[PDB]
RNA sequence: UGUAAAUA
């Protein structure tokens, strides 16, 4: 199976092997773990000539290396460190196989690297090959990385077909493990005409989203990167429920982002909500203090409050200081207090 | 003291 040259090479019988010396053997070395490493080592610091010898032997069977556990790296190097004519020629090799490669464990790495390095003409061609399979890729463990890369590298206007697919399914997709990632990429890179319809569906399901294992990240993302108007719509869903949400494993992360990225007014009102609100005998603030998740919200409130309001929070915390020691998470608030005293 | 992505 292995040629004598590859066999002997593996037994380390060529300590000084040069790229030039494996002529006629590139495909086989490429498909071998050490040989492939060999080729990659030798490529970054190889003359364009030596690079072209290697290329002549991988072009025709390029696909075969794209979907091979060791061969895909050799192809990728050509997309990075290759030449503007070698990259184009490999794009040709991918043509008609974009879908199949984007779902492939190894090919999808080649599709990704190619999108970063090819011209927009070749990008827009790769993209269009996913026309009709947007959701299949978004949900696939390889494909969703390719769709993310498209959104990051390709002109937003050529991505309109992905948006079309997401319309009406934003809630479902935001609660999906890969879809929430793709949603986040769309908010970062897409045009208003595209992000707006998607933001409308997010606002419509904020309540459910903030408590969802994956949805909470999409809402956090908006708070961290969104327009003030989108932030405020979200902040308005949290107001009235600060105490409850801050005790939730997922939504508590969102409440924190609210506290952190809300406008001054919105922030003051959120912190005041639990300074003023009672939970039975004592403040909401106090119940939060003892909670495995809420204590983090309390601390974040202490962090970002305006100095005058920090005083208010301190005053509410002060009377419980001794009894805080008895509670597992209360203890952690004590730690935060040292800072401020 | 608390939550999410892929190859030797």
Swiss-Prot record:
Residues 144-148 are annotated as: Non-specific-nucleotide binding in RNA target. Pumilio repeats lie at residues 21-56, 57-92, 93-128, 129-164, 165-200, 201-236, 237-272, 276-315. It comes from the Eukaryota. Expressed in brain, heart, kidney, muscle, intestine and stomach. Not expressed in cerebellum, corpus callosum, caudate nucleus, hippocampus, medulla oblongata and putamen. Expressed in all fetal tissues tested. The pumilio repeats mediate the association with RNA by packing together to form a right-handed superhelix that approximates a half donut. RNA-binding occurs on the concave side of the surface. PUM1 is composed of 8 pumilio repeats of 36 residues; each repeat binds a single nucleotide in its RNA target. Residues at positions 12 and 16 of the pumilio repeat bind each RNA base via hydrogen bonding or van der Waals contacts with the Watson-Crick edge, while the amino acid at position 13 makes a stacking interaction. It is linked to Spinocerebellar ataxia 47: A form of spinocerebellar ataxia, a clinically and genetically heterogeneous group of cerebellar disorders. Patients show progressive incoordination of gait and often poor coordination of hands, speech and eye movements, due to degeneration of the cerebellum with variable involvement of the brainstem and spinal cord. SCA47 is an autosomal dominant disease with a highly variable phenotype and incomplete penetrance. Clinical features include developmental disability, ataxia, and seizures. Sequence-specific RNA-binding protein that acts as a post-transcriptional repressor by binding the 3'-UTR of mRNA targets. Binds to an RNA consensus sequence, the Pumilio Response Element (PRE), 5'-UGUANAUA-3', that is related to the Nanos Response Element (NRE). Mediates post-transcriptional repression of transcripts via different mechanisms: acts via direct recruitment of the CCR4-POP2-NOT deadenylase leading to translational inhibition and mRNA degradation. Also mediates deadenylation-independent repression by promoting accessibility of miRNAs. This is Pumilio homolog 1. The lineage of its organism: Eukaryota, Metazoa, Chordata, Craniata, Vertebrata. The gene is PUM1. The chain holds residues 828 to 1168 of 1186 of the full protein.
């Amino acid at each position: 199976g292995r040629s004598r040259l590859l066999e002997d090479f593996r037994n380390n019988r060529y300590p000084n092997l040069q790229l030039r010396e494996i002529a006629g053997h590139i495909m086989e070395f490429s498909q071998d773990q050490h040989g492939s490493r060999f080729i990659q080592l030798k490529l970054e610091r190889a003359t364009p000539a030596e690079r072209q010898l290697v290329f002549n032997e991988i072009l025709q069977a390029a696909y075969q290396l794209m979907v091979d556990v060791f061969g895909n790296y050799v192809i990728q190097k050509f997309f990075e460190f290759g030449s503007l004519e070698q990259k184009l020629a490999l794009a040709e090799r991918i043509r008609g196989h974009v879908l199949s490669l984007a779902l492939q464990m190894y090919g999808c790495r080649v599709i990704q690297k190619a999108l970063e390095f090819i011209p927009s003409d070749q990008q827009n061609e790769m993209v269009r090959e996913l026309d009709g399979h947007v959701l299949k890729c978004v949900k696939d463990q390889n494909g969703n990385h390719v769709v993310q890369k498209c959104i990051e590298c390709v002109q937003p206007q050529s991505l309109q077909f992905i948006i079309d697919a997401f319309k009406g399914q934003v809630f479902a997709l935001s609660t999906h493990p890969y879809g929430c990632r793709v949603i986040q990429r769309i908010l970062e890179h897409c045009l208003p005409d595209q992000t707006l319809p998607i933001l409308e569906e997010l606002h419509q399901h904020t309540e459910q989203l903030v408590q969802d294992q994956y949805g909470n990240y999409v809402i956090q993302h908006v708070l961290e990167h969104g327009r003030p108007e989108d932030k405020s719509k979200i902040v308005a869903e949290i107001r009235g429920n600060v105490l409850v949400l801050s005790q939730h494993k997922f939504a508590s992360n969102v409440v924190e982002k609210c506290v952190t990225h809300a406008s001054r007014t919105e922030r003051a009102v959120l912190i005041d909500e639990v300074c003023t609100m009672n939970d039975g005998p004592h403040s909401a603030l106090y119940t939060m203090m003892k909670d495995q998740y809420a204590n983090y919200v309390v601390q974040k409130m202490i962090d970002v409050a305006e100095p005058g309001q920090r005083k208010i929070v301190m005053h509410k915390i002060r009377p419980h200081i001794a009894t805080l020691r008895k509670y597992t998470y209360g203890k952690h608030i004590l730690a935060k207090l040292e800072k401020y005293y």
